[PDB]
Amino acid sequence: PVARSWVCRKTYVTPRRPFEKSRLDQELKLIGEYGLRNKREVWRVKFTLAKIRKAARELLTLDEKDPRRLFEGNALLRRLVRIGVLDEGKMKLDYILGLKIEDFLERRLQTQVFKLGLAKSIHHARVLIRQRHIRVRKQVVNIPSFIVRLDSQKHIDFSLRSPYGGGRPGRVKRKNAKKGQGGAG
Amino acid sequence: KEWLPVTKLGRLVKDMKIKSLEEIYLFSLPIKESEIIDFFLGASLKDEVLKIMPVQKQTRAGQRTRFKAFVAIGDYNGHVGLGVKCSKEVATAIRGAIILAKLSIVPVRRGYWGNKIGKPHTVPCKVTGRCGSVLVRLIPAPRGTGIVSAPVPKKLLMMAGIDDCYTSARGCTATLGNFAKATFDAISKTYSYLTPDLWKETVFTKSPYQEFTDHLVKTHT
Amino acid sequence: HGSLARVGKVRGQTLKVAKQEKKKKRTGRAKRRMQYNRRFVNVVPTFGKKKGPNANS
Amino acid sequence: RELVFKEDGQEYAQVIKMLGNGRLEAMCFDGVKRLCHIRGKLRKKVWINTSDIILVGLRDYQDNKADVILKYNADEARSLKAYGELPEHAKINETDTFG
Amino acid sequence: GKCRGLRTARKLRSHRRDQKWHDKQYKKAHLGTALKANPFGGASHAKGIVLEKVGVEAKQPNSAIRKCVRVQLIKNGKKITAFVPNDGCLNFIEENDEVLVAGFGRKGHAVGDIPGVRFKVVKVANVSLLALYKGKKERPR
RNA sequence: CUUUAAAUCCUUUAACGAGGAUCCAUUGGAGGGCAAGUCUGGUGCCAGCAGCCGCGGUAAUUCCAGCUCCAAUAGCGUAUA
Numbered sequence: 001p002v003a004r005s006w007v008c009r010k011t012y013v014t015p016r017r018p019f020e021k022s023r024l025d026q027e028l029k030l031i032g033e034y035g036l037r038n039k040r041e042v043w044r045v046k047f048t049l050a051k052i053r054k055a056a057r058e059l060l061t062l063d064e065k066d067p068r069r070l071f072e073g074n075a076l077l078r079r080l081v082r083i084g085v086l087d088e089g090k091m092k093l094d095y096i097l098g099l100k101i102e103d104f105l106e107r108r109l110q111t112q113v114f115k116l117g118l119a120k121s122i123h124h125a126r127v128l129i130r131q132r133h134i135r136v137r138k139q140v141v142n143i144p145s146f147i148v149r150l151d152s153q154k155h156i157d158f159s160l161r162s163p164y165g166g167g168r169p170g171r172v173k174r175k176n177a178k179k180g181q182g183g184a185g
Numbered sequence: 186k187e188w189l190p191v192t193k194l195g196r197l198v199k200d201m202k203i204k205s206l207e208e209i210y211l212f213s214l215p216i217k218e219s220e221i222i223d224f225f226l227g228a229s230l231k232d233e234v235l236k237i238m239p240v241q242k243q244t245r246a247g248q249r250t251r252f253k254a255f256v257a258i259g260d261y262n263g264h265v266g267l268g269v270k271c272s273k274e275v276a277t278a279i280r281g282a283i284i285l286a287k288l289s290i291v292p293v294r295r296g297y298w299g300n301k302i303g304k305p306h307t308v309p310c311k312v313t314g315r316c317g318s319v320l321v322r323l324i325p326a327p328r329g330t331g332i333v334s335a336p337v338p339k340k341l342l343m344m345a346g347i348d349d350c351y352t353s354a355r356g357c358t359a360t361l362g363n364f365a366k367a368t369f370d371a372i373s374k375t376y377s378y379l380t381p382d383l384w385k386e387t388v389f390t391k392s393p394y395q396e397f398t399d400h401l402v403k404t405h406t
Numbered sequence: 407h408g409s410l411a412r413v414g415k416v417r418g419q420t421l422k423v424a425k426q427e428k429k430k431k432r433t434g435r436a437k438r439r440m441q442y443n444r445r446f447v448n449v450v451p452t453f454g455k456k457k458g459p460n461a462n463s
Numbered sequence: 464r465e466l467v468f469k470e471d472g473q474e475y476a477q478v479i480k481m482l483g484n485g486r487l488e489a490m491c492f493d494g495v496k497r498l499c500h501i502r503g504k505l506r507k508k509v510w511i512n513t514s515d516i517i518l519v520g521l522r523d524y525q526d527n528k529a530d531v532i533l534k535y536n537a538d539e540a541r542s543l544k545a546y547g548e549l550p551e552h553a554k555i556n557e558t559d560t561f562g
Numbered sequence: 563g564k565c566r567g568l569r570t571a572r573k574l575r576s577h578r579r580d581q582k583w584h585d586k587q588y589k590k591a592h593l594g595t596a597l598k599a600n601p602f603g604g605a606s607h608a609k610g611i612v613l614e615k616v617g618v619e620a621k622q623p624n625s626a627i628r629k630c631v632r633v634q635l636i637k638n639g640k641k642i643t644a645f646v647p648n649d650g651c652l653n654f655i656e657e658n659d660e661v662l663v664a665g666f667g668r669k670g671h672a673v674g675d676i677p678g679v680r681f682k683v684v685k686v687a688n689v690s691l692l693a694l695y696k697g698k699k700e701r702p703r
Numbered sequence: 704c705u706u707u708a709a710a711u712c713c714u715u716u717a718a719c720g721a722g723g724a725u726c727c728a729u730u731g732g733a734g735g736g737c738a739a740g741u742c743u744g745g746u747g748c749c750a751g752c753a754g755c756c757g758c759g760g761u762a763a764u765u766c767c768a769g770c771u772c773c774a775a776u777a778g779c780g781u782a783u784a
Contacts, residue, residue, distance in 0.1 A: 017737095018737075018738085018774075018775090019737045019738040019739095019773090019774070020336075020737080020738080021738075024738070024774090025445075028438070028441065028442055028445065028446075029442065029446060031438050031442060032438065032439060032441070032442025032443070032446065032447075033442075035435070035439070036435075036438075037434065037435045037438070037776095038438070038775080038776065039775075039776090040775090040776090053329065057327055060299070060327075094300055094302055097327055097328040097329040097330075098328055098329050099329065100329075123435070123436075123439060126435070171719095171720085407470060407472070407473075408470065408471060408472045409472030409473065409520045409521055409523075409530075410502060410520040410530050410532065410749060411520065411522075411530065411617065411627045411749070411750080412523075412749085412750075413523075413629060413649075413650045413651075413652045413653060413750085414649060414650020414653065414750080415650075415746075415749070415750045415751090416649070416745075416746050416747095416749080416750040416751070416766070416767050417649050417650055417750075417751090417766095417767050417768085418650065418750090418767095419745070419746070419750090419767090420744095420745055420746080420767045420768055421744070421745060421767095421768070422768080423744085423768065423769055424769085425769075426769075426770075429723060429727090430723080430725090430727050430728090431728085433728055433729090433776085434728085434776085437776090458739070458740075458772090459739075459740090459771080459772055459773080460733075460739065460740040460742085460771060460772050460773085461740065462740055462741095462742050462770095462771075463740080463741070463742085500619070502625070502748090502749085503625040503748045503749080503760085504748070504760070522617070524614075524615035524616075524617070524652065525614065525615065525616060525617075528617075591784090602783085604783085604784075605783075606782050606783035606784090607782065607783085620748090623757085624748070624757085624758085624759080625748040625749090625759095625760095626748070626749080626750085626751070626759090627749090648751090649750065649751055649752090649766085649767075650750085650751095664781075664782045664783085665781085665782040665783060666754095666782085667754050667781090667782080668754065669782095669783080673753090673754070674753065674754090674755095675753090682782090684781080684782085
């Protein structure tokens with residue numbers, strides 16, 4: 001007997017229809033619009049929203065004025081407000097079922113960098129996230145699938161060790177400066 | 186390219202003295218002129234083919250093939266229709282099918298799943314349509330679920346305006362005409378089901394014919 | 407002829423031509439970007455039935 | 464039509480008796496009883512009668528089963544008998560179609 | 563159901579067991595005959611030795627010959643008939659050369675126009691047939 | 704430098720390290736099911752393809768090769784319970 005974890009689970013689900021036009025076009029449109037890598041990421045976001053919707057339907061099945069329904073409904077509502085895809089005016093459990101997948105794709109770090117104004121295009125935003133140039137509250141992020149919170153949207157900025165945000169110049173700039181000093185002396 | 190009506194309903198809609206198709210559906214008046222609904226429902230009434238199938242008649246010399254065309258009509262916020270036409274060519278068949286489907290359009294109401302919040306989105310009860318051996322059953326669904334079905338009742342429920350369904354079928358579903366007609370019958374049977382939200386006695390509103398007897402005599406013989 | 411049922415006859419007698427030297431194809435994220443580009447945002451509102459990408463009639 | 468001969472993979476055989484099931488048997492002129500099979504285009508386009516001349520396809524993985532290629536009527540038979548392609552123990556016996 | 567009594571579970575259970583035995587798939591999967599007469603014996607792949615190469619004919623509506631081999635097994639030694647899939651791969655198979663046979667597609671059933679063959683070969687001489695087709699690997703010498 | 708019994712791995716970090724950024728992304732398909740050529744050359748019920756319907760008869764939308772493309776993507780195909 002060894003002391004390991006042995007706990008893991010899938011985060012994406014394969015749809016039953018492999019080849020039909022409309023859902024393929026809709027997923028391909030979402031991949032092109034938000035600049036994602038492959039269909040597994042949008043399937044992962046759909047899987048997470050499906051699990052959230054299943055939990056919301058399970059809470060809405062149980063009758064009013066119960067302790068566990070109110071407790072889990074307020075917990076899930078507070079988490080879904082604090083992740084940034086809900087509003088405090090819409091503070092009800094029956095509005096969870098009306099959410100769409102684009103709302104979950106809005107709070108991704110790549111599109112948040114693209115919409116804040118730190119990159120030209122959304123693909124430029126993704127190759128900025130993968131490049132380690134920015135930070136979220138004095139700590140850099142490399143992963144484009146970094147979901148942000150409502151209080152964490154304002155604090156995103158360039159990292160210290162980056163030529164875009166002020167710091168040491170990169171390899172190609174130093175190589176060109178060395179070439180210029182070699183050609184000059 | 187003008188419209189010359191043959192029934193008094195066509196003229197009475199033509200002179201803008203019938204406001205909507207709702208009282209035609211209320212008084213259960215038959216529709217025989219296809220340009221009335223084109224006068225009422227305009228740019229939002231879209232159509233597409235479902236299946237074109239050939240049938241054969243055996244004669245002395247060779248085989249004669251006539252093409253049968255199916256089509257669905259209906260706007261995304263209510264009414265929906267269906268029509269079947271067969272002809273020797275494809276263009277005549279699709280034009281006759283489009284005309285006959287536009288002529289025969291049913292209304293549908295929408296209900297709620299548990300909580301009556303916002304606009305209605307689903308079928309208010311369990312309805313069943315049957316023709317041949319084809320069975321189809323419609324269940325009310327929670328909001329944001331989406332239509333889960335075969336592709337052809339998915340298309341028909343998109344033209345019906347309902348976006349939340351749970352379906353269950355039985356029989357030979359490969360016959361597209363009977364499956365489409367059974368789903369159309371299941372959609373059209375949603376009014377012959379007395380829920381307790383309309384148990385009050387209705388007030389009998391005024392019939393169009395007797396109200397515009399004077400205009401009918403003034404216009405036509 | 408030789409004989410009727412010879413193994414590897416057509417592929418043995420098939421003319422042997424090689425590949426054409428070309429650049430590499432874009433793989434990964436930009437393949438999906440170009441696919442979305444060509445499929446959605448470089449279209450014109452035509453009429454009739456749509457044409458397949460391999461139509462070379 | 465044209466007088467084609469045997470090549471590397473073909474020999475000659477003499478059909479003896481009639482059998483069904485799309486198969487029939489013959490003695491090749493090497494002296495081996497072979498069981499040939501009618502191959503596609505000689506089934507009902509052309510018929511085969513008793514004791515005729517048949518080009519035979521061979522096998523590179525066994526020697527128990529043969530094939531069929533063509534057929535010769537009377538003048539092709541005496542033409543290939545003129546050069547000599549069979550042992551003299553076998554007899555053509557003036558095979559043709561009866562009048 | 564027909565028996566709708568409040569204290570009836572046994573008749574439902576025994577009738578369901580009997581009508582489950584009156585089936586084909588449940589009869590096949592739960593008897594020793596369908597696995598005892600199975601050449602693979604509940605195995606997906608198997609090795610064997612080729613002895614003869616026999617070309618079997620096609621069915622009625624199409625006309626061809628089909629290249630096949632006669633394979634004896636190692637674990638139980640019975641004689642089966644395999645089928646080399648691709649075009650011109652019989653030249654790689656010599657007398658007494660070990661192969662790797664597998665299933666043919668329809669779970670112990672004849673597939674297509676080949677009569678009486680339920681197996682096909684995957685690898686020969688401990689190398690895949692696909693690599694011999696594509697010119698990737700060479701047979702050992 | 705850190706880690707560790709000593710390492711190694713990860714991270715921190717010097718000096719190096721990419722224009723066709725040759726530091727070169729494969730696997731199964733293109734008749735219907737089922738997304739995607741009646742393109743070109745060769746064989747001619749032969750070779751073979753095909754889970755099913757079926758495709759090949761000297762003009763193959765299905766075979767053998769090239770180009771184009773479609774599906775998933777460091778993954779894809781086959782056989783079995």
